C-alpha cells in the first residue's frame, strides 16, 4: 500500500494529458463485399481528410 | 505553404525537414501540383502508413525532432483563407 | 498510351504485420501509362512479383 | 474527450485512490441524469434542421447587416457556411450534454477557433448571438430540466468564443 | 466509457448519435447501480483480494519469489502486490465505466515495453491476474462475478 | 444491425470484441422479443397505418392531390401510399435490426436524387413520415412508441 | 458483411414483403442463441493465445517437417506468419459465430486467399489441418453446446481453402 | 473570368500560358465591347425585367403571394424581387467576365442549403429565373439573346 | 482522347506526311459543323435534367418491374445509380458529339462496362432502352440535324453495350 | 536480392547444414573475382552515357525504321523511353555482374517487363539487338576477362525478354 | 549532418580554400581516434538495453514521484515513452560519439526538444537526471578512455536541455 | 551481404555505385579468406561450442531444466540445444556474408512472436547467446574474436 501512493497529490498528470493521439477509428475499404453505409462513411472520411 | 498542406492532407503530418521542402519546392517550380501530389502519394511513407486501402489520417510522429510539435500545430490548424476571391466581407456595423 | 490492368503480389519481408493486409499483398488495379514505369519499379523494389500486365485501353 | 465518469476516474487516478463515497455520489448523480440526457439528445437530433432554421432567422433578423451585400453572411456560399457552423455548434453541444462534460467542446470546437474566425473575417459577436439564439430555440423543445443543462454547454461555447 | 465510445464514433462520422447508440447509453445508465455496487464490493475488499491473489500467485509460481526471481525479497514482492493493486483499481474503474477503456489506456498500452524494461515475466502477469480473478469473483454473486470476470479476462489477454 | 456494427468496429482495430461490445450485443439479443412484438404489431396493422397516414398527409397538404399536384389522380395517390408502405416496412426492419441501417441502405442513400428525378417535394415526404410516426405510435404502448419514434424521426431527418 | 437478422431483412426486402411467421421464427432463433454466442465469443477472446498455442503445437507435432529446414514454416518470419494466420482464422471465425453468417468469411478472409497461398507457396492442406486443430482446441474450451456452432464456421473456412 | 481561368490552369502546371490560352484571351478581349454593350442594356432594363419577371412568376403561382405563401406580404414580395435583382446583377457580372464563375461563386454554391434554410421552394426560383430569361432575352438582339440565354440557362439548371 | 482534328493529325503523323488535300477537306468538313455542334451541346446542357427525367420516366413506365422490389433498380441507392448512369451516357454523348469522334466513349465509358454490368446483374437490354429513350428526347429538343449528329453516338453507346 | 554469397547461404539454409568444402570453395571463387568485378563496375559506371550513346546509335543504324515515322521508337517521347530502357538495362546488368548472381535481373528487370512489352507491342527482336549492342560496346571498354562476365548477364536479359 | 571530416570540409569550403596543414592535422587527429570510437560504439550497441534498464531504474529510484500515480511517467503508455526517449538519447549520443561532432545532437535531438517537452508536460530537469543516469551507467561499461568521449556528448545533451 | 546492401542502396537512388560502395565491396572481398577461416573454426567446433554454452546456460539458469521449466525433459533440452545450433549456423552465415542480413532474415524477423507462441523466455535466449559468444570468442584470435562477438552481440540485442 505504501508503494502505490501518489506523491504529486491532486496536482498530478491524468492519462488524458501527454502526447496527442491519432483518431482511433481507422477508415478502410475492404477488398470484397462492402456495406453501403460503411462505404458512404469511408467516402465521407476521405473527403473530410 | 502548399507543401505543408500536402503533407497535412496526405501524410497527416507536418513537413519533416528542410530537405522535404527543398524537394517539393523543386517539384512545384518545375512540374506543378500533379507531380507533387504523385510524389507524396507514391512515397514509401504513404505505403507504409496507409498502404492501398486505408484513408490517410492525422498523425503526430515522435521522430524526427520538431516533427511532433509541428504536426500538432498543423493538424490543429483549421482553414484560415476565404473560400472565394469574389465579394470580400468587411468589418463594420450598420446602426438601427 | 493509356491504362494498364496490373496484377501483382507483394510479400512481406521486413516484419510480420498484425492487421489483415490480404488486399495489400494480392491486388489488381488499373495503372495508367505515365505512372506505370514508376509503379512497376516500386513493386519490383518492394520484393513483389508482377503476375500479369494487360493493356485495357489504347 | 472525457465524460463525467472518466472525469471522476481521472480525479481518483491522479491520486492513486479507489472510489470513495463522494466518487460514488458523483457517479450516482451522473447515472440519475442519463435518461434525461438521452431523451434530450434524441429530441435535439430530431429537430436539428428546425432549430437551425429558427436560430438563423433570429440572427439575421436582429442583424440584417450580415446578409446585406458586403456582410460576412452575404453569398449563397457564405450563408451556407454560416448555417454549417451553427450545425457544428448544435451537434457538439449535444455531444457535450451527453458526455456531461465540456472537454469535447474545448478540444474539437474552441481550439484555435477565435484566431480562425479572426483570419476568416467572421464576426465573433454575431456568432455568439447565433449561439445564444440557438440556445433559446433549443431550450423550448428540450424542456426546462433539459434546457438548464443544455444552456450550460451553449454558454460554454459563447464564453469560449468571447 | 460507453458514452465516450458512442460520442467518439458519432463524431468521427460527423453525425448525431443513432437511435441504437442512444439505446446502448440508456441501457448503460439503467444498469449503473448494479455495476456501482459491484465496484463498491470490490473496493471494500481490496486488502483481502490482494493478499489472497498474491498467495495463490506465489504458490503456483514459487520461482518468482525464489532467489533469482523477479519478485524475490520483501520490497520486490511488495512491488508485485502493488502492481496487482493497481490492476484491481483499474478493474473497478472499468466496471463503473462500462468498458475496458480505463484498463486499456492506463495499464495496457505500452505494458509490454514497461515490463520488458523491468525484467517482469508477462506470463507471471497472466497467472497473477487470473488469481486475482479467482479471488475477486469469489466474493461476488454469479452475474456480478461473470461481469467482473470479463474484465479480468480482457486484462489477462492484454498481458498475454 | 447492432451485431454487424460491433463486429466491423472490432475488425477495424484487428481485435476481438471487448466486454463493452459483448454487453451491447447481449442487451440487444435480450431485447429481441420486445422489438419482435413491436414489429409484429406494426405489420399486422399496416393497412390502417398507411390509410390513416395518407389521410393526415393529404389534409395537411391538399395541394399534393390538387390539380397541378404531384399526387393528383388515382395512380399517383396509389404511388404515394405505396411509398408510405415502403417506409413502414423499412421502419419494421429497423426495429428488428436494432438500428437504422436497413432504412439507411434501402430508403435513404440516394433518396434526394430519386425524388428529384421524380418531381416529389421533400417536405411532403417529411410530413408524410411525421404522419406515419403519429399513427404508428398511436397503436403501440408508450414504451414501444418511444423507440419507434426515434426510427421515424431518423427517417424524417434523413429525408429533410 | 451480413448477419442473420440482416440476411432475413434482405430476403424479405428483395420480395418487397413484410415479416411473417417464418421470419419472426428465424429472428427468435437467433435471439435465443445470442447469449450462447456471446459467452462463446468471450471465452474464445480470453483464451485466443492459448488456443493458438495448443493448435499450432498439435499441427507442428503432426507435421514436424513444416518447421525443420525446407518446411514452409521454417524461419522466425515464416513461423510468425503461420501463427499470425492462425490468429486470423480464429478471430474471423469468432466474428462469424457472433454474426450467425459466413459472409464475413467470404468477404474478408477467403477473398483471394487460395491464389495468394498458391503464389506464396503455402501448403493449403497443412493450413486446413491447422484450422482443424483450432477447431478441436476451441471445442474443448467453449463447451459441447457452442462447439458445433464454432465448428460450422471452422469447417466453412476449411472448405473455402480446399 | 477567362483570364483568371487561363492563369490558374497555367499556374497549376508551373508554366507560362500556351499559345492556345493566349489565343483564347485574345478572342475574349476582342469581344469586350459587345459584352459591355449587352451588360449595359441589361442594366438599363433592370427594373422592367424584374417587374415583368415577378409578375409572370406570381400570376402562375398565386399561392406564394396569398395568405400562407412564402412571399406573402409587401416585405416578402420585396425580398422576392430583390433576389431576382441579385441574380440579374450576377448575370451582368458573368457577361462582363466571360464566364459564369461570378454567378457560380456568389449565388450558386450553397444556394440549395440557403433556400432550404429559408423554406423558399426551389421550383419557384427556377420558374422565376425562366421568366427573367424570357423578359431579358426579349430586350436584346438575337445574337446577344443567345449569349444572355446561356447564362440564364446555367442559372436555371444550377438552381434545379 | 482524340477529336476529328487529332484523328487526322495522328493519321498523317504515323504516315509521316504533311497535310494533303483530303486532310484539309476533312478539316473543312469538321470546322463547318462547329457552330451546329456548339448549339446542340449548349441546348443539351441547358436541358440535361429534363432529358434524364423524361427518359427515365419512359424507361420505367415501359418496364415497371425494374424499380419494383426484386428489380435491379429497386432501392433509392439503385435508382440513383441508374439515373446517374443515364446522366453519364448523355454527357459523354455530348462530349463525343462536340469532338466529332467516338473515342472518348470507348476509353472512358464503354471499356469494361459490359463486364461490369454482367458482374453486377445490370440488364443490358433495359440500359439500351434507356439510352434510346434519351436519344428520342434529345432529338426532340435539339432539332433534326443535331439529332442526326447525336444519334451516331447514342447508337455507338448502345452497340458498345452489346 | 541475393548475390553469390547469399545464394550459397540460402542453399545451405534450406538444407539446414553448415558450410562444407564445396561452399567454402564457391565463397573463395567469388572473393577472388570480387576485385575484377569492382574494377569492371567502375569502368562501366564511368562510360555509361557513352555506352548508351553508341549502342543506341548502332541499333538505330541497323534498324532505321525504328526511329522513322511509324516506328516503335518514333517520337521524342518514345525515343526517350527507348534510351531510358537501355540505361536501366545497362545499370542492372552492372548490378548483376557486381553481385555475381542473376537474381536482381529476375526481380528488378524481368519482373513483368515481357508482359509490358507485349502489351505495348515493343519489338522483342529489336530489344535483343539493342542489348547485344550494349554488350558489344561494354566488352570493348571493360576488358575481355570482365567482358565475358558481363556477357552472361546481358545474355540473361536477352533470353528473359525473348 | 556534420562529422569532424565534414566540419573541416565545410570550414575550408566556406573560404574557398584547399586543405592546409592544420586541416590535415585535424583529420589525422580524427583518424587516430576512429578505432576507439568504433569500439565504444559497438560496446554501447551491445549493452544498450542494459544501460537503459539500470539508468531508468536509478532515475525512478531517486525520483519515485515520476512513476507513482499522477507522475509524468505513470502509465504503461508514459513509462514506455520515457524509456523510449532514453533509448533515443543513448542512440544519438552514440551517433555523435562515432561522428566526433555534436552537430547531430543539435539538429536531431535538441532542436525544439525543450518546447516539445513543455507542451507535453515532461519535466526537463528529470530528463536531465535520466541522461546523467545513462552517462553514469555507460562510463563503467565502456572504460575511462571511452567514458570521457561518451561523457562529452552526454554532457552536451544535458547542457542543451538544462 | 555487403554487396547486396550496397547494390540495394545504389538502386534506391537509381544510380551506379559511388566510390564509397565500390571501396566497401573491395575491402569486403579482400578480407574474405579470413572470414572463411573464422567460419571454419566455428564450423568444426560444433559440439564444444553448443554443449558448453548449454551447460553454462543451465548452470546459470537452473529453472529452465528444473521441473516445470521450458527446457525440462530430454526432448525439450534437445530442442533448446537445437535452437542454439540454429543460431550458431546463422552466425557463421553472417560472418561469411559480412553483415547480419542472413541472421536477421532467417532468425530475427518475428523471433519474438515465435518464442511467445512457444512460451520460451527471451532472457533465456539472451543468456544462451552470451554463453555462445563467450565460448566461440575463446576459440578465436583477438581480431577475429572481436568481429564474431559483434555478431553475437547483434543477436543478443535482437533477442533483448
Ligand atoms: C531524438 C529526439 C526526440 C526526442 C527526445 C523526442 C521525445 C518525445 N517525447 C514525447 C512524449 C513523452 N515523453 C516522455 C518522457 C519522460 N517523461 C518522464 O517524466 C521522463 C522525465 C521523461 C524521460 C526520461 C513522456 C512521459 C511522454 C508522454 C507519452 C504519452 O503521453 O503517452 C514526444 C511526443 C510524441 C510521442 O511520444 O509519440 C516526443 C516527440 N522526440 C524526438 O524527435
Ligand atoms: C467543429 C469545429 C469547427 C468550427 C467551429 C469551424 C468553423 C469554420 N468556419 C469556416 C468558414 C465560415 N464560417 C462562417 C459563419 C459566420 N458567418 C456569419 O456571419 C455568422 C456570424 C457566422 C456563423 C453563425 C462563414 C460565413 C464562413 C465562410 C468564410 C469564407 O468563406 O470566407 C471555416 C473555414 C473553412 C470552411 O468551413 O469553409 C471554419 C474552419 N470549423 C470546424 O471544423
Ligand atoms: C484475414 C485474412 C488473411 C489471411 C488468411 C492472410 C494469410 C497470409 N499469409 C501470408 C504469408 C504466410 N503464411 C504462412 C502460413 C503457412 N505456413 C505453414 O505452412 C502453415 C501450413 C500455414 C499457416 C497455418 C507463411 C509461412 C507465410 C509466409 C510466406 C513467405 O513469406 O514466404 C500472407 C502474405 C503477407 C505476409 O507475408 O505477411 C497472407 C496475406 N492474410 C490475411 O489478410
Ligand atoms: C497503472 C499501470 C502501471 C503498472 C502496472 C506499473 C507497474 C511497475 N512495476 C514496477 C516495479 C515491479 N513490478 C514487479 C511485479 C512482478 N514481479 C513478479 O515478477 C510478477 C510477474 C510481477 C507481479 C505480478 C516487481 C517485482 C517490481 C520491482 C522491480 C525492481 O525493483 O527491480 C515499476 C517500476 C517503478 C517503481 O517500482 O516504482 C512499474 C512502473 N506501473 C504503472 O504506471
Ligand atoms: C447574392 C446571393 C444571395 C441571394 C440570392 C440571397 C437570397 C436571400 N433571400 C432571402 C429572403 C427571401 N427570399 C425570398 C424569395 C422567394 N420567395 C418565393 O418563394 C420565390 C420562389 C422566391 C423569389 C423568386 C423571400 C420571400 C424571402 C423572405 C423570407 C422571409 O422573410 O420569411 C434571404 C434572407 C435574408 C433577407 O431577408 O434578405 C437571403 C439571404 N442572398 C444572397 O447573399
Ligand atoms: C424502398 C425504397 C424506394 C422508394 C421510397 C421508392 C419510391 C418511388 N416512387 C415512385 C413513384 C411516385 N411516388 C410518389 C409519392 C409522392 N407523391 C407525393 O408528392 C408524396 C410527397 C410523396 C409520397 C408520400 C408519386 C406521386 C409517384 C408517381 C410519380 C410519377 O408518376 O412520375 C417511383 C418511380 C417508379 C414507381 O412508380 O414505383 C419510385 C422508385 N422506390 C424505392 O426503391
Ligand atoms: C527497370 C526495368 C523496367 C524496364 C526496362 C521497363 C521498360 C518500359 N518501357 C515502356 C515503354 C517503351 N519502351 C520502349 C523501348 C523499346 N522500343 C524501342 O523500339 C526499343 C526496341 C526498345 C528499347 C531498346 C518504347 C519505344 C516505349 C514506348 C511505347 C509506347 O508508348 O507505346 C514502359 C511503359 C511505361 C513508360 O513508358 O513510362 C515500361 C514500364 N520497365 C521496367 O520496370
Ligand atoms: C532458424 C530459425 C528458427 C529457430 C531459432 C527456431 C526455434 C524453434 N524452437 C522450437 C521448439 C523449442 N525451443 C526450445 C528452446 C528454449 N528452451 C529454453 O527455454 C531455452 C532458453 C531455449 C533454448 C536456448 C524449446 C524448449 C522448445 C520446445 C517447446 C515445446 O515443446 O513446447 C520451435 C517449434 C517447433 C519445434 O519443436 O522445433 C521453433 C520454431 N525455428 C526456426 O525456424
Author numbering:
A (entry chain 0): 940 to 988
B (entry chain 0): 1039 to 1134
C (entry chain z): 2 to 59
D (entry chain y), G (entry chain t), I (entry chain v), J (entry chain u), K (entry chain w): 1 to 162
E (entry chain s), F (entry chain r), H (entry chain q), L (entry chain n): 2 to 161
Wording from the paper:
Phycobilisomes (PBS) are antenna megacomplexes that transfer energy to photosystems II and I in thylakoids. Here we show the cryo-EM structure at a global resolution of 2.9 Å of the 5.9-MDa PBS from Anthocerotibacter panamensis (hereafter A. panamensis), a recently discovered Gloeobacterial species that diverged from Gloeobacter spp. around 1.4 billion years ago. The A. panamensis PBS features a configuration comprising two herein characterized linkers and presents a paddle-shaped morphology. The two-fold symmetric PBS contains twelve APC hexamers assembled as a heptacylindrical core surrounded by twelve PC hexamers, with approximate dimensions of 273 Å (width), 500 Å (height), and 129 Å (thickness).
The heptacylindrical core in A. panamensis has two distinct complexes—the bottom pentacylindrical and the top bicylindrical subcomplexes—each with a different combination of Apc protein components. Instead, ApcA2, ApcB2, ApcB3, ApcC2, and ApcE form the bottom pentacylindrical core, and these five proteins are phylogenetically close to their homologs in crown Cyanobacteria. However, both ApcD and ApcF are absent in the A. panamensis PBS. Although ApcB3 only exists as a single copy like ApcF of hemidiscoidal PBS in each bottom core cylinder, ApcB2 (β3) is found at the positions occupied by ApcF in other pentacylindrical core structures and is likely the functional equivalent to ApcF that occurs in crown Cyanobacteria. Additionally, the position of ApcD is occupied by an ApcA2 (α1) subunit in the paddle-shaped PBS. The EET from the top core cylinders to the pentacylindrical core is also efficient, given that the bilin distance between D’ and B’ cylinders is similar to the ones within the pentacylindrical core. Although the positions of A'2βApcB2 and A'1αApcA2 are similar to the bilins in ApcF and ApcD in other structures, it requires further validation if they are functional equivalents to ApcD and ApcF because ApcA2 and ApcB2, unlike ApcD and ApcF, are not single-copy subunits in an APC cylinder. The linker proteins were suggested to provide microenvironments for the bilins and are key bridges in energy transfer in PBS, namely the linker-guided pathway. Both linker-guided and non-linker-guided pathways are identified in the pentacylindrical core. The final overall resolution of APC core complexes ranged from 2.38 Å to 2.73 Å, allowing the assignment of all APC subunits precisely based on the corresponding amino acid sequences.
